[PDB]
Ligand binder design. Structure first.
Ligand SMILES: OC[C@H]1O[C@H](O[C@@H]2[C@@H](O)[C@H](O)[C@@H](CO)O[C@@H]2O)[C@H](O)[C@@H](O)[C@@H]1O
Ligand SMILES: OC[C@H]1O[C@H](O[C@@H]2[C@@H](O)[C@H](O)[C@@H](CO)O[C@@H]2O)[C@H](O)[C@@H](O)[C@@H]1O
Lengths: 729, 303, 304
């Protein structure tokens, strides 16, 4: 190709104006095969310039000068200057050196992590460049490990500046797009490390129904299999493939009962101890792999081995799938060691994700992160987080930052996994985040005390958790449409603020704030409430524009950074003027696609929303106060329209237009009501409540209302009253 | 010592006195060059105020009105007039809020919560404006005292406070723009009326004299050393004082014992952000609570 | 030298650069032709306009094809090149390893403005004599970040006046000027007094400079050079000899507000010592905490 240049023992491939592959080969042969990371090097032709001399070469694109002075790659022989001025002297890449600016990516797991842990670099940098080293093995055409690359150094130089979304799109072109999730993945999951019986598990599922909590997935953790019943001469019961018959005397009947309740079923698989001689599938595996059964030779875990993988999928997973298991929870914690040098977690995720496609369309796994490109094998499973405010306070940042290495379907244990401390408010705040996260999977440790059941908690916490869990199912249309946009267009559901606002310094200073799809901006509260206010808080950056609280309609004039206060039952979620958000009107109703959609419209600007579905596309347009709904294909679906406050149209069938110009634009939210509520719940002196209510009611000029609150001895009460005055300005 | 002298100068009598200690002299030159110069400035101000004080003295004797009044004499139905114990009226033209607490070393400024009655008020010294009615924490360096005059205030000052003479040969008429006003200067052997009506300033006296009048309208000396009775039209003259938000902001940030990164960010953000409500939202995020109140005073004056 | 620069056309011609692709003359001090073009065609025109010597401000790492630190190549070649236009010329540049004392002056760079930075700096300065690097120029008052305190600025200037080089410098902040009249009348007058003292000391400094060059004796010595067998000469990190006639104990801690004085523990060697400024006497040998107002610095001279 014209986009390929060889010089000395190096090869340079200009894939885009902003993406260059850099290779070294001692043998003069360069690698064309796919790798664990890279699935596609076919990119459209681009323009660039070369200065080639006897001893040096310079490649020049719109954004980078790449220099190579010959010989082995060193920090002196191979380096690049970006054509940007984001920094004063951090604009140069040197081979093998780190530079400042990397916005980070993700890491394997949150196992044993209490609050923050270090992350790996991503492809995004504030200074406009990043290098992604390909250190993986080569694949065969069908996707088996083929061995070592002939490109003994193989690098990707990203020089996208702050065009983060295009960097991610081209990353997906190189490493392959995320597959589409199935709709069931986007609902509530129930999970608990608890030794349920068939009877007590179904009783709990029927209790969820009675309690008005919708579920899409039934996880069965490791007590599904033999544990204490495993003879100690075999080792532990951690790995198992044999039903505990006391708890599950008829597995297929139990899974049929979950299927009748419209639940998808997954089992915990700890693969590391393989198939030992006590297991129900051992006789078939032993025959297939020619094991010495009289010496009880184990089929040790070996995912490098084709015969082992075949026996694992066909003779170990196969019978369980025949009993009705829908997909696999791969729960690997036993290290990165294999004869091939390929991480066993990568081999599991790559091969299990492929195998899952045989029994179901668009199937998933649930497994830990296995390095760049492992977004091809959703879903991510972050694992055994410590239950703490610190862990919750890290998790939104962790989740949005992961989009910087394209790993956009993290499923966290909602409420935290293990250890840590009880606080029903922490559980409630964690569920609020989970509902506005990629995946909402409730899960917990082997403790008698860590159940995430809403009715574990008092009546106030229970009702709020049920409300948020119902909200998750109202959001499934929005989530599923965003899912198809991840798969087809390479856009993350969860974006850091700096994707949309790359030149705003405040977009780098609100770590836990994120865009959730294209219509909603989320600022979860991740700190214990101030008991004097009976409210939690978070500093929100409002971009330019008019913003509304998604729930209350409280308005905010951007651009501003403003501390916002919410009771423990309320979450800061915001929509711009013109936002249109579809909601399922019947989130409890078991139906493959919603029979009724609520179109929730935020007044004050034009907008539009495209609802992508399995078998349809529905466009909602809001232009000069006219709201129109059209679909590719006709259906019996009934549309409800909510314009700000008021339901305008109920259950209208087919395509239509309606003029909202003559309809009430304003939400109910008002300063006086909100003020009374904040003063009333506050654990402060009644004389202070009386004086604040009286003075803020009497003083007419906004600047003097602000001067009055500025004299308050309670600094946080000042900030709370200021938020109300700012919204009421 | 310096704050106590500031109060004394705006008290009924300014008598420096001290104990038998070798260490308690009230001589200004007992102190360092900064304190000395400020004490000399305030002590000269006391003599500039003698015409105002002597006129108020004759008003105590003849009309039973105190020189120093609690706020509630003028504002009996305002609850805030009972909540500012150290704030007072000083004659009829000036309202005083002495600073009586050691400065905040992070700000290099002392402070007092001032109640501003209804009306437009000016700092007597700087011309910094304040829209009443409001209660507002005000910040001053140790060399500066919170003293305020309403729009229309007229304050006579002795132009020659060091000059040994039984009555001033020269009076400065210090006029605060924005309203009508008047001042009656009672003396041993004269009465002089200063009137400010629809922007016309008039001076008349019961008896004629050689006295020379100076007129200062806000910022600017309009008339120097003019003899006898006269009128002058100030409608076409600059009403506005120099005091400006940007200069005052730079000065407060510059003396503050805070991080230079904080100074840089506050100066940059308050210069860039155009909408007053967003300037206030920006300072509301500051981790230094007293710095918030100081920046808020400047924003309130600059609104 | 990139394609927008005023000297680029001449450099491009000298180094055979591709001007239509705007090929930069990338920094390469391993390259004889680059160095020649840098000195003759980049620095040369600026020297012709009257620039006397070069402040080499290098912060971009230690990488080169040769394995020689670019900072060493800059200091070695620039110091040599500076001798062409002026006798006994200098540079101003960071330390480039043992032997780089051949290329004065040392430039310590972007210190944080803090009491902690000032408290390190006398020790830093005297200890440098142990690898023969005796002409450190510190940013007097600190370079960047940190916190405002006019007393820190005044104490830092006191040290600077009794340091190898007295260069006032500061960051891009509107708030960090080292102008004496930035501060109140007391600080301003003290800074002016110390700045005048620096010029009173130039004969003493210049004589010590010729003694460094001809006899290998540092201007600033740790106490243990003169008193190697006295344990106390190893226990006063910020105390030093300044030439042969003066012993300096800078105050590097914020004053005690109850005393309105700063302090430092001074080790007085055997002998009769006088405060250089006041004549206050001290009988050695003794370790004694000494107190000074913020306008006064502990500097001592022996009888004789
Ligand atoms: O399948 C049970 C459980 O396994 C993993 O978590 C374990 C955790 O619960 C246990 O306390 C620790 C202590 O050794 O080991 C594992 O981390 C898995 O992460 C979890 O989701 C499962 O529920
Ligand atoms: O020439 C300007 C300046 O450069 C150097 O110091 C810089 C410093 O002021 C800046 O804040 C930081 C932040 O990136 O970079 C450099 O350290 C040099 O050391 C200094 O003397 C100069 O004044």
């Amino acid at each position: 190709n014209n986009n390929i240049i060889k010089f000395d023992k190096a090869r340079f491939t200009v894939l885009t104006e902003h993406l260059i592959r850099i290779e070294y080969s001692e043998t003069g042969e360069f690698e064309e095969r796919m790798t664990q990371m890279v699935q596609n090097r076919e990119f459209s032709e681009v323009n660039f310039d070369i200065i080639e001399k006897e001893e040096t070469i310079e490649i020049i694109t719109s954004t980078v000068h790449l220099y190579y002075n010959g010989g082995e790659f060193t920090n002196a022989s191979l380096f690049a200057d970006v054509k940007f001025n984001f920094s004063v002297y951090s604009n140069r890449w040197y081979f093998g050196e780190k530079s400042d600016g990397n916005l980070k990516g993700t890491t394997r797991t949150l196992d044993m992590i209490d609050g923050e842990c270090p992350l790996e670099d991503g492809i995004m940098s504030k200074n406009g460049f990043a290098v992604l080293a390909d250190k993986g093995k080569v694949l065969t055409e069908v996707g088996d490990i083929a061995g070592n690359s002939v490109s003994t150094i193989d690098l990707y130089l990203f020089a996208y500046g702050r065009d983060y979304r295009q960097a991610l799109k081209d990353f997906y072109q190189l490493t392959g797009n995320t597959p589409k999730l199935p709709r069931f993945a986007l609902g509530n999951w129930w999970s608990r490390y608890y030794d349920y019986s068939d009877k007590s598990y179904l009783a709990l599922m029927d209790k969820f129904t009675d309690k008005k909590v919708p579920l899409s997935v039934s996880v069965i953790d490791m007590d599904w299999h033999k544990v204490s019943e495993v003879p100690s001469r075999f080792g532990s019961g951690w790995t198992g493939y044999s039903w505990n018959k006391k708890l599950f005397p008829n597995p297929e009947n139990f899974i049929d009962e979950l299927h009748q309740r419209k639940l998808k079923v997954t089992l915990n698989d700890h693969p590391a101890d393989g198939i030992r001689a006590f297991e129900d599938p051992y006789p078939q595996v032993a025959q297939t792999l020619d094991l010495n059964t009289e010496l009880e030779e184990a089929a040790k875990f070996d995912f490098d081995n084709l015969k082992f993988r075949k026996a694992y999928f066909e003779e170990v997973h196969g019978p369980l799938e025949k009993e009705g298991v829908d997909f696999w929870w791969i729960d690997w914690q036993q290290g990165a060691i294999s004869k091939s040098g390929v991480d066993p977690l990568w081999l599991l995720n790559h091969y299990q994700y492929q195998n899952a496609q045989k029994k179901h369309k668009n199937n998933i796994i649930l497994s830990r992160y296995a390095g760049p490109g492992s977004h091809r094998y959703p879903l991510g499973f972050s694992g055994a987080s410590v239950i703490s405010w610190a862990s919750l306070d890290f998790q939104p940042y962790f989740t949005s930052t992961a989009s910087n290495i394209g790993y956009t379907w993290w499923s966290h244990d909602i409420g935290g996994h293990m250890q840590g401390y009880k606080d029903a408010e922490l559980s409630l705040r964690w569920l609020q985040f989970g509902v506005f996260s990629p995946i909402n999977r409730l899960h917990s440790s082997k403790s008698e005390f860590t159940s995430k059941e809403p009715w574990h908690f008092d009546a106030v916490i229970e009702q709020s958790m049920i409300d948020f869990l119902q909200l998750r199912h109202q959001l499934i249309p929005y989530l599923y449409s965003a899912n198809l946009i991840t798969a087809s267009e390479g856009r993350a559901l969860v974006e850091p603020l700096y994707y949309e606002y790359p030149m705003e310094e405040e977009a780098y200073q609100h770590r836990n704030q994120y865009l959730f799809g294209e219509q909603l901006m989320v600022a979860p509260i991740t700190e214990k409430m101030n008991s004097l206010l009976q409210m939690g808080s978070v500093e929100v950056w409002f971009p330019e524009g008019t913003w509304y609280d998604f729930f209350s309609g409280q308005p905010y004039d951007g651009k501003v950074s403003l501390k916002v206060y919410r009771e423990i039952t309320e979450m800061p979620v915001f929509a711009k003027a013109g936002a249109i958000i579809p909601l399922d009107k019947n989130p409890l109703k078991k139906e493959e696609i919603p029979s009724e959609i609520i179109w929730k419209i935020f007044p004050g600007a034009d907008g539009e929303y495209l609802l992508l579905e399995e078998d349809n596309e529905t466009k909602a347009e809001f232009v000069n106060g006219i709201f129109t709904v059209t679909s590719k294909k006709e259906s019996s679906r009934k549309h409800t329209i909510i314009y700000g406050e008021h339901e305008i149209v109920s259950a209208k069938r087919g395509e239509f237009s309606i003029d909202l110009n003559g309809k009430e634009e304003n939400f109910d939210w008002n300063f006086s009501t909100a003020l009374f509520r904040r003063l009333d719940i506050a654990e402060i002196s009644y004389e202070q409540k009386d004086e604040i209510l009286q003075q803020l009611s009497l003083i007419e000029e906004h600047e003097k209302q602000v001067a009055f609150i500025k004299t308050n001895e309670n600094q946080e009460l000042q900030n709370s009253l200021f938020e109300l005055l700012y919204s009421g300005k």
